[PDB]
Amino acid sequence: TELFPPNLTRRYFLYFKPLSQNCARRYRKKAISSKPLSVRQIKGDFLGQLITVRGIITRVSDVKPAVEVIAYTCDQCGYEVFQEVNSRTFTPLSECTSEECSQNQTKGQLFMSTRASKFSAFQECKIQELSQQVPVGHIPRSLNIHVNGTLVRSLSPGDIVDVTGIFLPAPYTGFKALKAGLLTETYLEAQFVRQHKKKFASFSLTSDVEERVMELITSGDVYNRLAKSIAPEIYGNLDVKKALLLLLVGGVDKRVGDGMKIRGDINVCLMGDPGVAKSQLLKAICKISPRGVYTTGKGSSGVGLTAAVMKDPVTDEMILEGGALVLADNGICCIDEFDKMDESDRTAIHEVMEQQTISISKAGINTTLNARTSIL
Amino acid sequence: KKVDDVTGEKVREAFEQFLEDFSVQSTDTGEVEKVYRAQIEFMKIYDLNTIYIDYQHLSMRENGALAMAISEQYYRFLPFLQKGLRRVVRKYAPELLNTERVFQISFFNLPTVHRIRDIRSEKIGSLLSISGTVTRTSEVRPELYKASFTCDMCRAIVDNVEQSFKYTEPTFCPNPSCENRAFWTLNVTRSRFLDWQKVRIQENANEIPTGSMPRTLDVILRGDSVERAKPGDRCKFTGVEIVVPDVTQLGLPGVKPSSTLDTRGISKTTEGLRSLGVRDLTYKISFLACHVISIGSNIGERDQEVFLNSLSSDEINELKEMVKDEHIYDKLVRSIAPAVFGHEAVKKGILLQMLGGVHKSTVEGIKLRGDINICVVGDPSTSKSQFLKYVVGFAPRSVYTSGKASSAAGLTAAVVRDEEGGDYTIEAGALMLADNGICCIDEFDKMDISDQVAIHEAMEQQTISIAKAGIHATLNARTSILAAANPVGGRYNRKLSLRGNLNMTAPIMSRFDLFFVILDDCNEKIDTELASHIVDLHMKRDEAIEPPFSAEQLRRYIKYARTFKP
Amino acid sequence: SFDRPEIYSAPVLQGESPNDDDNTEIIKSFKNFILEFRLDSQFIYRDQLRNNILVKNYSLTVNMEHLIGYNEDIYKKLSDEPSDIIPLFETAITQVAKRISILSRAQSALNSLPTFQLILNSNANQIPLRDLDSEHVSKIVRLSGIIISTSVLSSRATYLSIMCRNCRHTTSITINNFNSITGNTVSLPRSCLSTIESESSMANKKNCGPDPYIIIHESSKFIDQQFLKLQEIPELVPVGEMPRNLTMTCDRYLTNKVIPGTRVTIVGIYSIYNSKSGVAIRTPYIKILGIQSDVETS
Amino acid sequence: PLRIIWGTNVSIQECTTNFRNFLMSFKYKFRKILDEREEFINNTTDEELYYIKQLNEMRELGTSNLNLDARNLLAYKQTEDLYHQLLNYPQEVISIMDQTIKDCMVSLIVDNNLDYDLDEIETKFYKVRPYNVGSCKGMRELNPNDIDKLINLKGLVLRSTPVIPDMKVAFFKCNVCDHTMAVEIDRGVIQEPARCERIDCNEPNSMSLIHNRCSFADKQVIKLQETPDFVPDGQTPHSISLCVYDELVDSCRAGDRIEVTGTFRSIPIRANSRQRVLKSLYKTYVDVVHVKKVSDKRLDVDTSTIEQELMQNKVDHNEVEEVRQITDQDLAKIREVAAREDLYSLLARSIAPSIYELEDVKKGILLQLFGGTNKTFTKGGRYRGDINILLCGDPSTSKSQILQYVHKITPRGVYTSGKGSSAVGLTAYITRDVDTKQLVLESGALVLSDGGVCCIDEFDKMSDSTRSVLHEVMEQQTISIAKAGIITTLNARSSILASANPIGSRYNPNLPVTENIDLPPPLLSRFDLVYLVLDKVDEKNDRELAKHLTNLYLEDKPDDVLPVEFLTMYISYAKEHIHPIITEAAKTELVRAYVGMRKMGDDSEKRITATTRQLESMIRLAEAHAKMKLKNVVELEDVQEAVRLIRSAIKDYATDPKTGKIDMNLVQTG
Ligand SMILES: Nc1ncnc2c1ncn2[C@@H]1O[C@H](COP(=O)(O)OP(=O)(O)OP(O)(O)=S)[C@@H](O)[C@H]1O
Ligand SMILES: Nc1ncnc2c1ncn2[C@@H]1O[C@H](COP(=O)(O)OP(=O)(O)OP(O)(O)=S)[C@@H](O)[C@H]1O
Ligand SMILES: Nc1ncnc2c1ncn2[C@@H]1O[C@H](COP(=O)(O)OP(=O)(O)OP(O)(O)=S)[C@@H](O)[C@H]1O
Ligand SMILES: [Mg+2]
Ligand SMILES: [Mg+2]
Ligand SMILES: [Mg+2]
Ligand SMILES: [Zn+2]
Ligand SMILES: [Zn+2]
Ligand SMILES: [Zn+2]
Ligand SMILES: [Zn+2]
C-alpha cells in the first residue's frame, strides 16, 4: 500500500533543551552545549552541533509560511502527490507522478492545495555579539537564526538572549567569481530561547516565585530596601533611587469609555552639576529594566529615535524599522545629556511623554506608531 | 472551408443598408438627403481615409438593436463593418478602393461619457467614450499592419498577412516547396504599416475622488486621428476598450491565470533519449480610440480670416455689434472677474495680459518679448488669488500653480523613467501646458531659489533646455506669468521699497511689466459695500454676478482681437 | 548541504471513471484472469505460477484460447497490438508473483523478483510461411516449419548500473524489452542526468561531455538471447526455387528449448528491422513468444 | 451514512438544512439573549423574522447580496457548530449558504404564491457576505495554520491599484477554418487546445487566443494600513495588500477607516519573470469578502463629497453603505431632542465628558463638526463650509485630548504633529511598490483628510516652509501640485484643527496677543476661530477640576450627556439633510458686525486686525449654528451667536483695544 507518511501525520514540533551547567557540574560532565559562545567563537568545526550562542537580537523578520511539503491533487486518479521542499526556492510539479497515472498513457494534471500542504511559521533573526564579548578594537559580528514552528515571536530586537540551536550550513549566497570551493553560509536553527531579562508581561504567579516574593515581603521594609539596592555603588541619593524605583514600577494607565486615555508611566528628569553620578544611575536603570534603551543627546538623531522605512529581503517587503523610542516600548528609555538635544528630538520626546505615540507624516509613510516609553 | 458568423453577416448587411438608406430632413429647405452617401462622395474628391458616423443616426435605425449590437461587441463586429463599408464604396465610388486603402470608421457623440475610474472589465472589446486630460504624447510611429514574410526553405515571399496586436507569423505556407511552418523572415521594405501614437491621459480635476490620486491611461490613436491630441487639454476619446499584455503583475497578490497546453489526444511512447510550453496570462486595460474631439480646457489659427469663417452669421453679428460699441473698453474691464469688487487697475492688467502684445524678431537675431507678466503684491485677504482662479477658469491654455507645491522639473519640463527601462521620456511642465497662455502662480515668495532660477531662465530665454540623462532638447515656453506674492512679514511695509518687501530675485523683478500693490485701508463705506457684496454673493449664488459680457462672448472677443497686429 | 526532496503519493478520492483502454484497468483485468480462471475445477494459472516460483522459474505459460473463454476484448487488444499489451500482462504476472513469493518464504520455513516472462501458446489456425503479408506486421502470428540453426547465447542487459566519467553521478537503467533486433531501442543517455535532476541544493558552466556514463558490470544484471532460423518444410516447396526462411529472436526461458532440425510451430510477433534493394525496404523477423514442439527426438 | 468533504468536517446536507432552519427561524431576541441584553428586548422589532424579512426586501429591491452576522449564527442553537465551520472553511460553507439563499428565494415565492417570476430568481446569482467573524487580531499575530480562514481587519486605506482584468473565460480561434470556442478557467489554469475541435479541420497548433474576444473579471489590490486593537511590545504598523473582486472594486477610497472581513490567503511568488521557479517563502494577503465603512462610534463621511461615487455605486450594484440607515423611531428622537431649549449646551457638553469645562472650546469644536453648508456655483466656482480652529494656550489645558476626540470621532481625518511632518508628506509623494516595482503616487496627510478634519498638534513647532503648504487648503480647500510626476489640482476639503503654545511655552500678559500667538497674518487670517485657552488659578475652579479629574480613578472602568452613537447620528443627519441659507435679517447683522469690528480695529502689529476672512468665518459659523438646530434658514440669532463665539474665543472682552494686553485677575473668569 501507499500510506500517508508519519511526517504528514505529525501535529507537534520537537525541540532540544540544552543541559544546564549545574547538572553537568553535579555529575562530572563537560558539555559544549551548555557553555554560551559568542558569534566570533562559532567556527566551522561547530557545524552540525547543538550549541548555545549569547548575544543581543538586532533584527527579527515577520512570521511567514515556509512550505516544507506541497500537496497537489489529481483529478484523473484521485491521488494526492506530496513534494518535499528543503531549499530557498522550488519548482512546481505539472504532470502527475502517482502510480496510477505513471502506468497509464494519459497523465493527469496536478493542482496545488494550500490547506493540505504543510507549512511552518518561519522567522529569520540577527543576533549580535555583546560589547564585552568583542575583542579590543573590533566590530561586533552577526549570526543568522532560523526560528521555525512554535518558537516564533519569542525573539524581539534589543533582547539579551541565549539561543540554543543546531549550527547548520546553507547554500552559498554571493558573487560567483569570489567563491573558491564548496563555500557554505551558516545559520542556527533555534531550539531553545533563554532570556537574561524576563519580560514583565510574561510574568506568571507560579509556586517558585511565590516563596521568594513572600520572603522579600516578610524581610520587612520592601520600599526602602528596593530603593537602596538599585545602585548600591552610589552613596546617598535615597530619594532619587526611590523615584527611580517608582519609575520602574509606574502607575496605572487609565482608559475612559469615550476612548481617550491617560498614561500611567512616570517621566523623571535628573538635572544637576557634573560628578553626581546621574549617568551611572541611568545605566543602572537600563540594566534593571527588561526593555531599557540608553541614548545620547547627540548620539541619537531624529531618524534614530522615531522610525525609518527599510526593505526586508527575506520577506521582500518595505517595513518601518523603529528607532530608540520604538525599541524601548513598554520600557524605560534613558536619555543622557538631555540639554544637548536638537529641536527635532525635543519635539519627538515632547509628543512621546504625553501622547505615548509618534505621528510621522513624511515622504515615506503617513502613520502613527505606539511608543509607550517611560522617559528618564 | 471557413465557417462564418451568422450574427456578423446580419450586422454587415444591416450596416451596408444603413450606409445607403439613412437620410435626414434638410433644415434650410426640407430635402431628404442621404448623409453617408454624401460623406462617401466627399471622401472620394479629397481622397480621405476616414468616415465619421454619428451614433444617434445608427441608434434610431430599427428599434436600437443594431447600435446595441455594434456597441457591445465592437471588436468582434469591426471587420464586418469594414467589409460592409468596402462593399458600399465599391458599389458607389470605386476610385477610393484602388489607393487597397485602409478605411477607418469613426463613431462619435455617444449618449454617455464615462470616467477613467468607471472603466470595468465587462466593457473590454466594446464601444465606449471616455474623457481625460492629455499629459504625454508620443512620436508618430509605423505599426505593422499587413506584414510580408519569406520562408527560409522556400525563399519565396507571401503578402497581406493580418497582424492582430501582438506580432504573428502565419503557419499556412501556401508554397509546397518545404514542409515546415514556424520559420519565417520579415521584410519591412514591402510590408504595410499604419500611423500609431500613444498619448497618456489623466483624470480630470473634478472627477478625482475624495482621497485618491489620479490614475493614467495609455490611449492609442491610429490613422487620421493621430496628432489631434495635445499635451495639456481635456479631450473626449471615443473608441474600444482593449487589453494589453502586462508583465508587472508578476508579484501582485492573487492567483494569476496561466495557459497550459492540453495533452489528452496526443499519443506518446516511453522510448526515452518532458517539456511543455506554458505562459502566464497577465493583462492591463488600454483604450484604442477611433475619434478624438478636444473639449474646452476651460469650464465652458493666428489669421483672422480662418477664425471668421469658423463663426456663423448670428455670432459674427454679435461680434460686430460688440466691436461697434464706443464704450467697449469699459465693458471689457468691468467684465473681468465679476466676483471681485473694485481693483479696476488689476482687471485692466489682466485683460491686457490676456490680449498680449506682438512678437518681433530683430534682423540681428534677438527676439522681442510680446508676453505681458503681471505680479500682484499686497496685504492678506485682498482677493489676489481670486484673480488667478478667474484667469485659470476662464483663459484657455492656462494652468494654476501653487508656489510651495511646485518644482523645478514640474514648472518647466521633467525627464521621467518608465517601468525601470532604458527609455527616458519628456513630460511637459506647467510652463509648457500654458504655452501662449497664462501661468498662474500663487505664493511666489514661498518658492525657493532654485525654482526661481529655473523659471527666470525660461522667462528670459523663452525656452527650456534639457540636458539630463541621455536627452538633450530645447522646448518652447512662450508663456505670460501671473504671479501673486506676499511681502516679507505678511503685512506690506509701506516704509520700505518694492524690492525690500519682496524676497524674490532681481531677474524675477526685472521681467515683470506691471506690479499691482493692493493695500488694505479701513474706511466705513468701502468696507460696508464690500461686505454687502460678499454676503450678497453668498446669498444669491450666480444671481449676484451680472457682468456686461458673458464668459463665452468675452472669450470670442479675446480670440478675435488676438488676430490683429497693431 | 541538503538532500534530495522526495515525491510520494497516496490515494484519496475516486478520480475520473476508469476506461477499458487504460493500462491500469488492463493490468487489473489480466490479474483477474490469472487469479480467477478455472479449466475444469482447478485454478490452473495460479497453481502454475506458484509451482514456477518454487522451482525458481520466472515465467508463465498461458493458452490463448483461455483468453477467448474469459475476456475477448483483451484478446483482441493483445492480437492487434502485442507490443503494448505483453508488458502489461507481464506486469500483472509479476504483481501476482510478488505477493505470492512474500507469503511463501515466511510460511514454509533479501530476495529480488525480476519481471516475469509471458510465454503464450495456441492451437489456432497456422499461417504458412509463404502466406505472411504486410497486414501481419506487428501482430501475433502462428507459423510452423523446421529449424536450420540456433545461434550462440548473446548477453543482453536487463538491469544495468551506470556512473558518470567525471561527474561521478550514479544511475540505474532497467530494461524490460529485449525483442528488438539490429538497433538500440534503449541505450545509455547522451548527456549526464545530474544537471536536469537538480537533486542537490548546492548544484556544484560544467559539462560532463557527450556519452559520459560507463557501465559498472559487477552490479549489472544480464539475460540470454538466442537467434533462430526457421524454414518452411522441404516437403511442400515448389520445384524450381530455394525455400524461404525467417530470422527469429527469443530470450530468457525460451532459449535452448529446441535443437536445430526439429519441426516446431511458433507463436510470435511479426516485426521489422532495417539492415544497412528498394528505397524503403525492411527485413521481417519474428519475436518468439512461445515454442511448441510437434515431434520430440530421442 | 454521513458524507464529509475531504479535508474538512463540512457536510453539505447538514449545513444546508441547518442554514435553512437558521434563515426561517431566527429572531433578534436570540441575539440579545446571547449578548446578555435582556432588558433591551422589545416587542415589535425582535419578535419578527429577521432574515425572512431581509430576503423579502431583497426581492423587492432586486438586490442579490445578503449581509450575514456570524454572531447571529452563534445566537441560534442549531448553527452553533456552523459558525465554526464558517470560520474554518469559508470556501465551501459560503457556497453552501449561497445555494441555500437561492433555495429560500425560490421557496418564499412558491410557498406564498407571489406574482414574481421564477426565471429572474433562477438566472440571478445570490451570494452572502459574512461579517463580524470575531476579534480583530493582528495579521502579524496570525499563523500558517490560519490560511483559508475568515478574519477581521480594521485599517486605513492608503492607495489602490487600477482595475485589473483577470481572465475567466478564454476565447480560441482557428487560423485556417475560423472555428471559435471558449474554455472556462479551472483553479487559475486554462487548457489551451492543441488541435482544432472540428472533425473537418484537425490541424495541430492552429488555435490562437484572442485577448479581446474573451471575457474578464475585475480585480483590485488595496494597500491597507492596519490599526489593530492590541499592539505587542515594540511593534511598528505595517501595510497589507488585500484583493477585492467583481462588485467590491472601487468601493474603498484612499484615507477611510474600514472593517474588512475576508479569508486569509497565501500564494507562492515567482523568483524571476523568465523562469517558473517559485520562492519557498509564501506571500500572505487577504481575499476580501465584505467591507464595513460605517461605525457607530464616529461620524459618517460627507455625502456632498462622494455624490458621483454614490451614483457609481448605484450603477455597479456593489451594495456597500457609506452612511448609516436612519429608522423612523430614532429620527423621531432626533426631532424630539432638536426641540430642547438647551440643545446647544447639551450638544457641547456631550462632546468630551472626560474633559472638564472648556464650554466655548467645545461649542467651537461642535460647530466645526457640523460645518457650514457647501455652495457650488453653476458657473463653476465652489464654496466649502469648512471651519478651521486654532487652539493656542497654556500647557495642560486638555487641548491635545480635544484633538484626540476629534480624530476618533471624524470619518476620515488624519492626526499629525509639527516638526514630524513635511510638505511632501502633507501633499503627495511617489513611492516604489513592493509587488510591481513601479513608481506609484501616494497621498499626503491633507489629501487623506479630505472630507474630514485634519488635526495638527504642536502647530508652533512646524517650520514656516511646511506651514506654507496649508494656505491653499485653508483658503480654497484644494492642493495644486505641479511636480515631475503630478501636475493637477486635488480636492482637500479638510477642516484644520491646530494646537499651539506661546513663544515662552506659557502665555505672558505683558506681551500682546499677536506676539504670544506668533503666527504670520496670512496664516492667522485663515483660522475661523482662535481660542486662547488660559490657566487662571482659582479656588473653586481648581477644586472642581481636581474633583472631576480624581473621580475617574475611583473605579477601574469609567449633568446629562448624549451617548456617542446618538450624537454621531444626529450630527450626520444634520449635515446630510440641512442646508441653511442666509436671509436679509442675517445679512444686516453680518454687515453691521463686520463693519463694527473694522472700525474698532482703527485704534493703534500688537493687535489682531479684522479681516474679510473673519466675515466669511462669521457666515460659516452662523450657517453651522443654523444647521445644528435643524433650521433651513440662518436667522439673526445664529449670526449673533457666531459673533459672540468669535469674540469669546479670542477673549476680546478681556483684551484692551489700545495696548492689546490681557489682564488675568480683573476681567477673566475661571
Ligand atoms: N554619590 C556618588 N556615589 C558614588 N559615586 C559617585 C557619586 N557621585 C559621583 N560619583 C562618581 O563620579 C563619577 C561621575 O561620573 P558620571 O556618572 O558621568 O557623573 P555625571 O553626573 O553623569 O556627570 P555628567 O555626565 O557631566 S551630568 C562616576 O565615576 C561616579 O561613579
Ligand atoms: N475685493 C474683494 N472682492 C471680493 N471678494 C473679496 C475681496 N477681498 C477679499 N475677498 C474675499 O475674501 C477672501 C480673500 O481670499 P484670497 O483671495 O485668498 O485673499 P488673498 O488676497 O489671496 O490674500 P492671501 O495671499 O491669500 S493671505 C475670499 O473669500 C474673497 O472672496
Ligand atoms: N481642563 C481639563 N479637563 C480635563 N483634563 C484636563 C484638563 N486640563 C488638563 N487635563 C489633563 O491633564 C493632562 C495634560 O495633557 P494635555 O492637556 O493633553 O496637554 P496639552 O493640553 O496639549 O498641553 P501641552 O501638550 O503642554 S501644549 C491630560 O491628561 C489632560 O486630560
Ligand atoms: Mg552624563
Ligand atoms: Mg491668496
Ligand atoms: Mg499637547
Ligand atoms: Zn494522477
Ligand atoms: Zn515554406
Ligand atoms: Zn556527470
Ligand atoms: Zn480548425
Numbering used by the authors:
A (entry chain G): 189 to 564
B (entry chain F): 101 to 199, 260 to 433, 441 to 467, 498 to 763
C (entry chain 5): 2 to 110, 129 to 223, 233 to 304, 319 to 340
D (entry chain D): 176 to 733, 739 to 784, 788 to 853
Sentences from the paper on this structure:
In our structures of the free DH (more than 90% of all particles) from the two large datasets of non-crosslinked DH-DDK treated with ATP-γ-S, similar EM densities were also observed. After multiple rounds of local 3D classification of this region, we finally obtained a density map for the DH with an obviously structured fragment nested on the NTD-A surface of Mcm4. The map was resolved at an overall resolution of 3.2 Å, enabling us to unambiguously assign residues 132–153 of the Mcm4-NSD to this density piece. The NSD fragment, largely in a loop conformation, wraps around the NTD-A of Mcm4 and extends to the subunit interface between Mcm4 and Mcm6. Its N-terminal residues before residue 131 appear highly disordered. The N-terminus of the structured NSD (residues 132-141) forms a U-turn loop at the juncture of the OB and NTD-A subdomains of Mcm4. The C-terminus of this fragment (residues 145-153) contains a short β-strand which is parallel to the N-termimal β-strand of the Mcm4-NTD-A (residues 176-181), leaving the connecting residues of 154-176 in a highly flexible loop. In fact, two of these DDK sites, T140 and S141, are located right in the middle of the structured Mcm4-NSD (residues 132–153). It is likely that DDK phosphorylation of these two sites are important for preventing the NSD from binding to the NTD-A of Mcm4 and facilitates its displacement by Dbf4-M4NB.
The Dbf4-dependent kinase Cdc7 (DDK) regulates DNA replication initiation by phosphorylation of the MCM double hexamer (MCM-DH) to promote helicase activation. At early G1 phase, when the DDK (Dbf4-dependent Cdc7 kinase) and S-CDK (S-cyclin dependent kinase) kinase activities are low, the origin recognition complex (ORC) together with Cdc6 and Cdt1 load the Mcm2-7 helicases onto origin DNA to form an inactive MCM double hexamer (DH) encircling dsDNA to license replication. During this process, DDK and S-CDK, act in concert with various origin-firing factors to convert the DH into two active Cdc45-Mcm2-7-GINS (CMG) helicases which then serve as scaffolds for the assembly of bidirectional replisomes. Compelling evidence in budding yeast has also shown that the essential role of DDK in DNA replication is to relieve an inhibitory effect imposed on replication initiation from the N-terminal serine/threonine-rich domain (NSD) of Mcm4 (residues 74-174), as NSD deletion can bypass DDK function.
